[PDB]
Design a protein around this motif. Sequence first.
Motif, PDB file in Angstrom:
ATOM      1  N   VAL B  46       0.793  -1.014  -0.002  1.00 30.83           N
ATOM      2  CA  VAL B  46       0.081  -0.226  -0.050  1.00 30.83           C
ATOM      3  C   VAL B  46       0.894   1.238  -0.029  1.00 30.83           C
ATOM      4  CG1 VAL B  46      -1.701   1.165   1.397  1.00 30.83           C
ATOM      5  CG2 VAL B  46      -1.910  -1.076   1.032  1.00 30.83           C
ATOM      6  N   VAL B  47       2.071   1.051   0.671  1.00 32.57           N
ATOM      7  CA  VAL B  47       2.539   2.176   0.611  1.00 32.57           C
ATOM      8  C   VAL B  47       3.727   2.663  -0.512  1.00 32.57           C
ATOM      9  CG1 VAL B  47       4.780   3.391   1.891  1.00 32.57           C
ATOM     10  CG2 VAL B  47       3.302   2.062   3.188  1.00 32.57           C
ATOM     11  N   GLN B  48       4.035   1.535  -1.337  1.00 34.88           N
ATOM     12  CA  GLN B  48       4.657   1.876  -2.528  1.00 34.88           C
ATOM     13  C   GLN B  48       3.972   2.281  -3.614  1.00 34.88           C
ATOM     14  OE1 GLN B  48       5.927  -2.268  -3.508  1.00 34.88           O
ATOM     15  NE2 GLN B  48       8.082  -1.893  -2.392  1.00 34.88           N
ATOM     16  N   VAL B  49       2.804   2.452  -3.431  1.00 33.59           N
ATOM     17  CA  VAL B  49       1.825   3.087  -4.415  1.00 33.59           C
ATOM     18  C   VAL B  49       1.821   4.638  -4.368  1.00 33.59           C
ATOM     19  CG1 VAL B  49      -0.713   3.462  -5.327  1.00 33.59           C
ATOM     20  CG2 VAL B  49       0.043   1.177  -4.448  1.00 33.59           C
ATOM     21  N   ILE B 203       4.503  11.195  -4.586  1.00 32.28           N
ATOM     22  CA  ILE B 203       5.522  10.395  -3.896  1.00 32.28           C
ATOM     23  C   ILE B 203       5.102   8.865  -3.729  1.00 32.28           C
ATOM     24  CG2 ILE B 203       4.610  11.206  -1.614  1.00 32.28           C
ATOM     25  CD1 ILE B 203       7.388  11.226  -0.569  1.00 32.28           C
ATOM     26  N   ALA B 204       6.079   8.055  -3.708  1.00 35.44           N
ATOM     27  CA  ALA B 204       6.024   6.714  -3.510  1.00 35.44           C
ATOM     28  C   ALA B 204       7.175   6.053  -2.639  1.00 35.44           C
ATOM     29  CB  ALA B 204       5.981   5.958  -4.822  1.00 35.44           C
ATOM     30  N   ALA B 205       7.401   4.718  -2.388  1.00 40.52           N
ATOM     31  CA  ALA B 205       8.319   4.145  -1.506  1.00 40.52           C
ATOM     32  C   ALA B 205       8.792   3.071  -2.503  1.00 40.52           C
ATOM     33  CB  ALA B 205       7.505   3.503  -0.305  1.00 40.52           C
ATOM     34  N   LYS B 206      10.231   3.019  -2.248  1.00 43.34           N
ATOM     35  CA  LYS B 206      10.962   1.917  -2.893  1.00 43.34           C
ATOM     36  C   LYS B 206      10.804   0.613  -2.464  1.00 43.34           C
ATOM     37  CE  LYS B 206      12.795   2.853  -6.079  1.00 43.34           C
ATOM     38  NZ  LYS B 206      12.365   3.101  -7.490  1.00 43.34           N
ATOM     39  N   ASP B 207      11.683  -0.354  -2.808  1.00 44.21           N
ATOM     40  CA  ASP B 207      11.476  -1.997  -2.233  1.00 44.21           C
ATOM     41  C   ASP B 207      12.210  -1.927  -0.942  1.00 44.21           C
ATOM     42  OD1 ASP B 207      14.141  -1.384  -3.214  1.00 44.21           O
ATOM     43  OD2 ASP B 207      14.116  -3.322  -4.343  1.00 44.21           O
ATOM     44  N   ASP B 208      13.201  -1.214  -0.621  1.00 46.62           N
ATOM     45  CA  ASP B 208      13.940  -0.956   0.780  1.00 46.62           C
ATOM     46  C   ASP B 208      13.180  -0.192   1.784  1.00 46.62           C
ATOM     47  OD1 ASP B 208      14.209   1.600  -0.253  1.00 46.62           O
ATOM     48  OD2 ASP B 208      16.310   1.610  -0.327  1.00 46.62           O
TER      49      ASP B 208
ATOM     50  N   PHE G 151      -6.551   3.336  -5.503  1.00 49.15           N
ATOM     51  CA  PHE G 151      -7.207   2.271  -6.224  1.00 49.15           C
ATOM     52  C   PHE G 151      -6.617   2.219  -7.727  1.00 49.15           C
ATOM     53  CE2 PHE G 151     -10.995   4.181  -3.371  1.00 49.15           C
ATOM     54  CZ  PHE G 151     -10.738   3.112  -2.548  1.00 49.15           C
ATOM     55  N   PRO G 152      -7.063   1.617  -8.558  1.00 45.22           N
ATOM     56  CA  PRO G 152      -7.114   1.508  -9.821  1.00 45.22           C
ATOM     57  C   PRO G 152      -7.528   2.938 -10.630  1.00 45.22           C
ATOM     58  CG  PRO G 152      -7.927  -0.738  -9.606  1.00 45.22           C
ATOM     59  CD  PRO G 152      -8.297   0.377  -8.139  1.00 45.22           C
ATOM     60  N   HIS G 153      -6.396   3.390 -11.323  1.00 44.21           N
ATOM     61  CA  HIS G 153      -6.622   4.982 -11.965  1.00 44.21           C
ATOM     62  C   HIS G 153      -5.768   4.922 -13.070  1.00 44.21           C
ATOM     63  CE1 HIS G 153      -3.246   5.465  -9.352  1.00 44.21           C
ATOM     64  NE2 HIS G 153      -2.921   6.283  -9.853  1.00 44.21           N
TER      65      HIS G 153
END
Lengths: 50, 221, 50, 205, 205, 205, 222
Positions: B46-49, B203-208, G151-153
């Motif tokens: 959810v955070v990486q989105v 803004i998003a989050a990486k894999d680390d 959500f999907p967008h």
Amino acid sequence: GVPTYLLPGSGQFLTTDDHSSAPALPCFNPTPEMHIPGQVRNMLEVVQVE
Amino acid sequence: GVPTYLLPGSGQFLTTDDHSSAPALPCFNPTPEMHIPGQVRNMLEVVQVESMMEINNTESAVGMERLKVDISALTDVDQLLFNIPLDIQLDGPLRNTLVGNISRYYTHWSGSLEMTFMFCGSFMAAGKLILCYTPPGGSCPTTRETAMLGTHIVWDFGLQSSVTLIIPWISGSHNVGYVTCFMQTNLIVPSESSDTCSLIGFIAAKDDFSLRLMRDSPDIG
Amino acid sequence: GVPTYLLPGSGQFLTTDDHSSAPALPCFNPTPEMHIPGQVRNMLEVVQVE
Amino acid sequence: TVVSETLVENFLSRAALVSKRSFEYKDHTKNFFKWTINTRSFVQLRRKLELFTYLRFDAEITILTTVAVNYVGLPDLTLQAMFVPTGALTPEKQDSFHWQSGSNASVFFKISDPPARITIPFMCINSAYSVFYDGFAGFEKNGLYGINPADTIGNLCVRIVNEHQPVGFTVTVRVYMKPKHIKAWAPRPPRTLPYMSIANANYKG
Amino acid sequence: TVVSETLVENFLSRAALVSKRSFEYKDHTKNFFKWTINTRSFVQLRRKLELFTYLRFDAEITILTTVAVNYVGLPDLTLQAMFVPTGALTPEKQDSFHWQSGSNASVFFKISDPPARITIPFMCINSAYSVFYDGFAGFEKNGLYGINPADTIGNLCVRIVNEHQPVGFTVTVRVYMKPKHIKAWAPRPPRTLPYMSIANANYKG
Amino acid sequence: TVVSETLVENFLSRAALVSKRSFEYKDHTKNFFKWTINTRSFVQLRRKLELFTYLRFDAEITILTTVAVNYVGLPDLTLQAMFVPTGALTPEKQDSFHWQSGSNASVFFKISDPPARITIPFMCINSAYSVFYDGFAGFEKNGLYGINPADTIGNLCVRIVNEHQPVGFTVTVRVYMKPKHIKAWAPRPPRTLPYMSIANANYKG
Amino acid sequence: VLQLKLGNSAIVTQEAANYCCAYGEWPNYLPTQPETATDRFYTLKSVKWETGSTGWWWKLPDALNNIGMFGQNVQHHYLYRSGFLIHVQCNATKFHQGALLVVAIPEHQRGAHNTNTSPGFDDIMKGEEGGTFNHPYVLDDGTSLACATIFPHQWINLRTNNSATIVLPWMNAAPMDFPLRHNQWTLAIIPVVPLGTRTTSSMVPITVSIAPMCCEFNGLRH
């Protein structure tokens, strides 16, 4: 011996629990089971009848 | 039978303990599990989105225009557009996000972030910008060249319509970082197009990106 | 279940005892161990120094 | 909108209260109860078992004791639950020895403790219990109708071990019975009409 | 300065108090409480579960009972915690039999003892619970908005087994619920705005 | 006259009392205590741990509760011991919800029972605790000397679950901490001079 | 340029490649079917999008209650499970600026501002007409629009791409659902960036198409 600790909810009486208890009359052999026609192992067999 | 003795702390009720207990309704079969799209087994997915940063936060700013930053054609050269603090606990542009709202349930947070900028103006808008990042305790730039001493990229409206920025592994727990943006040249728009354009940060989050030490959310509502 | 009886001295708190207890914060991973110079596993190594 | 649990074993097996009695105790300057532990008294378990003709199960008896108040505080009484099987005559000369005879099975339990739980085995001359018995009791030729002497489990006898305690508290005893190893034969129609008496099948309508 | 625990199973699973009630007991010369054990009341667990759409978990209920003082001393009461599943109508004629029916699951526990701990299984018609239900209740055509009749766990009913005890003490009952075997689907945005009412999603701002 | 036990694990690990407090309770018509559970207070364990620089261990907390008399008799209170980790702000509006939030780990124990025993894991940003920290707190440039913000375990919060009980008894709580899985680095000289203050290394002589 | 032909009709569209699958899945069959009867894209009424437009929302299948051939099977059968392919194409010239966020909100509970009264039947189900966002910043459910991207967008920018295609599989707890009662998905177009132009006021039309692909029906009656 083996140290043990009581878990939360120990000693309570549950209605739906299933456990083994000490028998009241040991060394007593019940009557053997004769074959009785119409053994019903499931309540759905009664429902399927018209 | 088997002799046993009670250990210290036996019979107490712990909140975080995990143990098996007697079921309430035996001989009951729950409904089988149908396959439901979007199964989430980890909170990091959810955070990486990507999420929307609000850069327009100011006095008397309420509603839809808090997501965009107005840029007109009357602005001059080398004017500060904004600054984005990286503090999650305090209120920056990052106060309410996908990475921010989940991190408020935790304390220690360590990982590399990412920022994406999108230009929503017209097709014929010309000009260039500058995108810089401030290291921790990095002598926040007065005008321009101080921001140039660090990692930076020159971004054009005409060529690239998007921004990819990888920020190297910030850290915080219970003034460090910043983002500086200025005007490289004037905004050139035709006569028919509007004078004011805007931008939308992401803004998003990486894999680390990692999390731990669950706690209670500071915001009651 | 398994019948058990309490041994003499059960439930007491001993200062020198060593036993496992329920953790306070489960599903928490401590920081990994970096190599730190001068690891002392015995108090005699400190005594042998002049 | 929109067979494991349907089995007979899970259907007939449930914890229900088949006996409720509280004896008044204030000043005696006796206290005991016995009952035939039959399923015809409690109305929900009766019709529950009226569905089938012959039944084979092992009764599991659990005695729950609660003490009410009629601040002093609740002392801890010692109670004795004895099971009297069928065939033991009861010439009661209380205060002396029948209860304490080693033939009958007895159990001791305090007020504060896990409830006393015993499992009564299957005691019968025939293969299974008879819920519906067409005939008369024994051979008297006019002997009682509707009661089969072949099936009687016994009487459950419970008394307090300690002597008279100078309190005005009333002891409440609850007896739950959950059958196990249940085997069913010859299912019958349910009885919609109310129960006029527990001794026979008469209906009102 | 400078993925094991991040899992959903460890994130949603925590011990929280979903019900707090204390009934006044001094002299009655009744005492009981029932509630739908829903997650929309306690504010921190609500928003905790508003993050996800559908949820599949087994509720683990633990009842903690404390007795206050309004020196006498604290007697040991016997309490009965019964779970009433959805679909059981409640025509309460108290002092008589509904509680003691063998259909509903009940548990007995004293005041001084390890807290009574039961695990409620997953009871649903569909595959998982619905936190966000867009539609109306049943088919009434104008039926209630925001409440799905498909998902109701039941009511938790707790009363004291013993009769009236002549004390002025107030019994405080605390019910904690820690879900297990949690499965998540369709994460949603958090709700920053305060909760005006638990019956629907209306916001103030 | 005339290496197993010499190991560091057996040397530093012992049961000692790191906190002693008794709150006066007679008539309130509040009661609680919180402390940072640090080793600089108790004088024998301090110098015991001043021998080494960095330490890695899991604190094992055990709460012992005794009730004194200021014949009535001792009622059985219910106590709640909650551990507050570092980073949780404490805006105390007592009588309402912070204690009961499901985030913090809590434990319930009676007066008469085995002492409540919990094991706190290793919570740090760095690899091990710092007993000797040369520097200042955070970056304030003049920030506090001798205290490292990087290492704080938390606060131990304990209150009584039950409401006010009309007795004049004083509750005494004792907290013992025995570390386990101890790893040592950089042994230092012992400090012969007395401790003037627990906040820094100043000596008198 | 590339025409997408499904059924007996079709609509001229932009090149369709790497279309968004909601939660990384596609509406497969449940382990008769309307690949002919009710198939073709149903184009709703084009909404006029101006500078002060807050937004619009169409619940599924709220806008589809009575539409073309699909409007018959809504009240005709007992249950169904249906996927959705939503293509929103907004035509504009190169002199217009703005941004449109097309997002699908599964299980959308609406709300009201500064009152505890729950909305009625006519407020929830509007049919084909569709509603208008009262406060699109808070999404009307109380949440925040900043984190609404979970959500999907897809993003419609008058610079890069003027159209968007979102595929929604069947999302429900039950294998089938009630046509006139529960709304599984919700289609929302959120104008994060308003319109701007040389003239004081302009009009930008928006076209919305929805294809109930790979569905079933049970409980034949009437």
